[model samples]
Target chain A: GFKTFYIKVILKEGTQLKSARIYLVFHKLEELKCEVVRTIPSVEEIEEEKFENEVELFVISPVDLEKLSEALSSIADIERVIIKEV
Target chain B: GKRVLIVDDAAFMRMMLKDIITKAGYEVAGEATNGREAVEKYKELKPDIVTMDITMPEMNGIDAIKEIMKIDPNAKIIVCSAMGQQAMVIEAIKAGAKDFIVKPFQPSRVVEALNKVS
Candidate 1:
């Protein structure tokens, strides 16, 4: 079950945001039929303030990159959406 | 530490929630057998969170929630529900519960629900 999707999202630097807000993006991904397998830094770790510049997510979906990108764009407080590999 | 009240007619459920929440660094304020007792305990303990079972004798969870809310408007309650009672869970949400956890009790899900609400 290695159906993988990668997104490198970069928000404008110095945005003091919480993981709760980032959770909205993950929820949006779930809405797009992308089953989130696991999130890097995990939700628990992120809640405790442990994350690098670009958080990585793993999901499984039948939808393509364009649709996923549009869905990601709908979320608030996101800067860039990067799709390196699928 | 977060303090929580566990309410259920079933002794096992109370024991299970107590074991889980305490391991997650929460204090188990008390346990109640039914909704009426829950309301009484709510007034007495004033815990940070309440995990109330949806169905219990002498006042179900919804009525208990209403009673508790009348006493304290900003009460933080989490419904402990079974799979088939999704509608009842939603009703509890409408009546002002902060969140819910479906049982037979996964420790991770209980912790997740608490984190989401508190």
Candidate 2:
């Protein structure tokens, strides 16, 4: 089964979007073998301390399906992670 | 209560962390002054989480995270990094650290990271 995670991530104060997104793209997505299919406000439009940036991703296997939100919480900018699945 | 091991070479840092860790409703299980000592204390104390400092006299924090993972892959660690140490912080995250706190430490952020990581 293919699993999808619709993740809404809120940022901590003074955290830059580029830095947080780098962590999202580099360490997290690759580690899970997932790809971001959609991002709200796009990456360029995301500003810190306003709005929860949303990311929807496709997991290649989704075998470790439960870890999506837990794993994503490791990044520094992530103040909170809310996930809805599809 | 969750137990946290504080790993830093500086006594002041350990002191500061002690206050914040306790404020976060976690107990200070043990303290280690360097990375190797951190590994040893981790094996001995088996704390629920650790706050690790990056630059230390022996075995930097990244290596300690690797070593700690060998002991227990699920060990939770929060890296304590200063400004201009972005690469180190990223590397620490890559090495399996669960979260991080920036230096010139803010008590609020420290507690936030701890509560969230918990």
Candidate 3:
């Protein structure tokens, strides 16, 4: 079955280089074979460092939700990740 | 095991990084003596990750990182930095390095950064 999730990522306080941190999230998701369908602030905005500490993502994949959460949590400077099936 | 390209101007630093990475059970795909060679090897070897030294003869690691990022924005690069090089490390990160490890390398820290970056 195809699974869809909406994810919110929050960076730790005073995390420098917002864009790079966001890119790491994108990179990690790709590593897990997940496709990002959409982002709250938009990819361009995130790349431009226009967003705040929080960013949202809509992804599609068959990967286990718990595993996804664990994986994102492992990256440094990521404060937390919130996910919901949609 | 992940494949890695280790780059440094000094043979000793390259050897140290190679030893640490290989012992961590990853393959040392290749080594480069300078940033120019690093970029060339990056294109040719296409390793899973790169350990880049900041100061090099031809191009320097930051420029090499920029070049590699242009080739593949998804390149996983970990900057190998020495003390007092925080500014350069920050530049490398902005240039697309995924992580960094300080010099007098600790095996555990190197392994941890490699695992985290992947």
Candidate 4:
């Protein structure tokens, strides 16, 4: 196993999102056995961006590509989940 | 009540965590001034948990983590890293550290990391 590593999620149309929902997403992924490595734009910024629309979330997990696809599909605002960039 | 060994090159940072972790009801098992001492104390004390600073002289926290892992594979070590040290953090996790606390340490966040990982 070459070990699938990190994931970067682009959340578009996130303006209508709520902080509780954002926290819910993190907590939900944690429940799904994914480590919520870190959140970019900071938690506070994410909260404030609830009306600005787009956000990027960076996470790390040992789960496979199929698992990630299935897991990320549940996040409503998630525009894309890229396993690796470049 | 987990016993934690605080490892940092900065006297002030150690003081800060000592104040925070101790007051939060966790025991401050011991303190180490740098990565070398961290490794030494970890082997000697074998505390329940360890809080390691990323940038330290001589050994560095990541190497200290590797050494600690060698000493005891199940060591519950939490790394302290500054933001932007993603590569170092990934390396620490690869070397077997349980988790990490980012700098500008929020009392809540640090305690959360400790409780979750410990």
Candidate number with greatest lDDT = 3
Indicate the residue-level lDDT of A56 in model 4. Answer: 49
After superposing candidate 3, which stretches have Cα over 4 Å from the reference?
Answer: A1-72, A76-86, B55-59
Q: Which tens-of-lDDT digit does each residue in B63-97 have in candidate 1?
A: 99888889899888888776556457657766877
Residue-by-residue lDDT tens digits, candidate 3, B58-94 = 4467888899999899899998776656457657776
* Model 1 pairs in collision: none
The CA lDDT of each predicted structure is 0.72, 0.72, 0.81, 0.68
DockQ versus reference, model 2 = 0.26
Clashing pairs in 3: none
**Tens digits of per-residue lDDT for model 2, B1-118:** 4899999988998999999877778899999988889999998998999999985425477888999988999898888877656567667878888777778788877886787667
TM-score of each: 0.58, 0.72, 0.60, 0.60
Q: Interface Cα RMSD for all candidates?
A: 11.9, 3.6, 5.5, 10.6
For candidate 1, the docking band is incorrect
* True lDDT of residue A38, candidate 1: 69
Model 4 Cα displacement at A74 (Å)? 20
Per-model DockQ against the true two-chain complex: 0.04, 0.26, 0.10, 0.07
> For model 4, what is the error of residue A53's alpha carbon versus the real structure, in angstroms, after optimal superposition?
11
Candidate 2, clashing residue pairs? Answer: none
* Model 2 misplacement above 4 A: A1-10, A16-33, A37-86, B55-59
Top model by DockQ, which number?
2
